[PDB]
């Protein structure tokens, strides 16, 4: 049922690229999502990442819980810590943010959220880094095609995503263990572009655009999308399919396009067995600001580093990362980094 596209290796701006980008936009506007074909290498790397994830999740909780940092939000999140619309969600998560050594100038300077990933081991590290390198190449192709499909300069989005704050959430959902099967409630993702991969089990549902339906701007206080539409059709089951990733827009793409793209609502149902998946965020630079593309007189901006830092401080208010931001007043660095820019 979902539409599938094959991306060119290089996006150059030829008229065929523009046609493809238009078709990607149309698929998002119709279905909220599409598939992209993976080649043998992309597929191999995806499967290796899922295998590493499964092995890590079998480690004892005492070890998993030690994979945390007070410099970066990368690392482990136990089941039941994340909350959607007031209700705790079920997956355990390993988050991979930009892996910066303590010698990096941003880590030395104490920028919030910047530091080395607390990897469980080097084998897991290599599997996830190799996968994320491929995901990033796809993210850049997608963003060039999306700019072209809107008749924008080809580098409109990729100028923002140079050294972007790309990150991945590596998920394990438990089997169902009672009448409850809400693995994650309905929500929209805070990022720019989401590339999702899953194993063969099944559980992701997405909501297409619906004519006449009011959608909230989830980047605004007071317009949370959490829980909305959860018990009303339409919800499309994202059938596990060999040889594809799926792609949907996040909140920052909804903001930049003024709602011509909508951030795709989605939710996860627990299956009768455990399920592994990955959600990759292809993001602006920490220092970049998103802006409305089609409303030149609009003053509103989303500063990405501020957006991310505030999101994760709210997600994980007692994590040692959040404690150190507060103890050392690391949010002051964000204020400073804006000072002499246009
Ligand atoms: Cl998922
Ligand atoms: Mn999500």
UniProtKB/Swiss-Prot annotation:
The keyword Iron applies. This is 2-oxoglutarate-dependent ethylene/succinate-forming enzyme. It is an enzyme of class 1 (oxidoreductase). Its cofactor is Fe(2+). The lineage of its organism: Bacteria, Pseudomonadati, Pseudomonadota, Gammaproteobacteria, Pseudomonadales. Keywords: Dioxygenase, Ethylene biosynthesis, Iron, Metal-binding, Oxidoreductase, Plasmid. Simultaneously catalyzes two reactions, namely formation of ethylene and of succinate from 2-oxoglutarate, with a molar ratio of 2:1. It comes from Pseudomonas savastanoi pv. phaseolicola (Pseudomonas syringae pv. phaseolicola). Pathway: Alkene biosynthesis; ethylene biosynthesis via 2-oxoglutarate. Monomer. The keyword NADP does not apply. SUPFAM superfamilies: Clavaminate synthase-like. Pfam families: 2OG-FeII_Oxy, DIOX_N. One of its GO terms (biological process) is ethylene biosynthetic process. PROSITE patterns: FE2OG_OXY. Optimum temperature is 20-25 degrees Celsius. It catalyses: 2-oxoglutarate + O2 + 2 H(+) = ethene + 3 CO2 + H2O; L-arginine + 2-oxoglutarate + O2 = guanidine + L-glutamate 5-semialdehyde + succinate + CO2. Activated by catalase. Inhibited by chelating reagents such as EDTA and Tiron (4,5-dihydroxy-1,3-benzene disulphonic acid), and by DTNB (5,5'-dithio-bis-2-nitrobenzoate) and hydrogen peroxide. Fe cation binds at residues 187, 266. A dual-circuit mechanism has been proposed in PubMed:1445291 for the complete reaction, in which the binding of L-arginine and 2-oxoglutarate in a Schiff-base structure generates a common intermediate for the two reactions. Its EC number is 1.13.12.19, 1.14.20.7.
């Amino acid at each position: 049922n979902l539409q599938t596209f094959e991306l060119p290796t290089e996006v150059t701006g030829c008229a065929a690229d523009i046609s493809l980008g238009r078709a990607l936009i149309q698929a998002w506007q119709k279905d909220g999502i599409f598939q992209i074909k993976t080649d043998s290498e992309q597929d191999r790397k995806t499967q290796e990442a899922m295998a590493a994830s499964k092995q890590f999740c079998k480690e004892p909780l005492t070890f998993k819980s030690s994979c945390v940092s007070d410099l970066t939000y990368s690392g482990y999140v136990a089941s039941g810590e994340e909350v959607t619309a007031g209700k705790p969600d079920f997956p355990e998560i390993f988050t991979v943010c930009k892996d910066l050594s303590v010698g990096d100038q941003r880590v030395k300077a104490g920028w919030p959220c910047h530091g080395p990933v607390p990897w469980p081991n080097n084998t897991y590290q290599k599997s996830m880094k190799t996968f994320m390198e491929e995901l990033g190449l796809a993210g850049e192709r997608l963003l060039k095609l999306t700019a072209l499909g809107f008749e924008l300069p080809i580098n409109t989005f990729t100028d923002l995503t140079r050294d972007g704050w790309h990150h991945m959430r590596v998920l394990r959902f438990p089997p169902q263990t009672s009448t409850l099967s809400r693995g994650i409630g309905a929500h929209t993702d805070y990022g720019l572009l989401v590339i999702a991969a899953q194993d063969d089990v099944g559980g992701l549902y997405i909501r297409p655009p619906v004519e006449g339906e009011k959608r909230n701007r989830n980047w605004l206080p007071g317009e949370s999308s959490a829980g909305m539409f959860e018990h009303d059709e339409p919800w499309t089951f994202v059938t596990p399919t060999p040889g594809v990733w799926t792609v949907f827009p996040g909140d920052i793409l909804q903001f930049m396009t003024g709602g011509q793209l909508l951030s795709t609502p989605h939710k996860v149902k627990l299956n009768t067995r455990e399920r592994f998946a990955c959600a990759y965020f292809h993001e602006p630079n920490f220092e970049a600001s998103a802006y409305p593309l089609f409303e030149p007189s609009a003053n509103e901006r989303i500063h990405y580093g501020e957006h991310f830092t505030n999101m994760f401080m709210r997600c994980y208010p007692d994590r040692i990362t959040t404690q150190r931001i507060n103890k050392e007043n690391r949010l002051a660095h964000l204020e400073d980094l804006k000072k002499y820019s246009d």
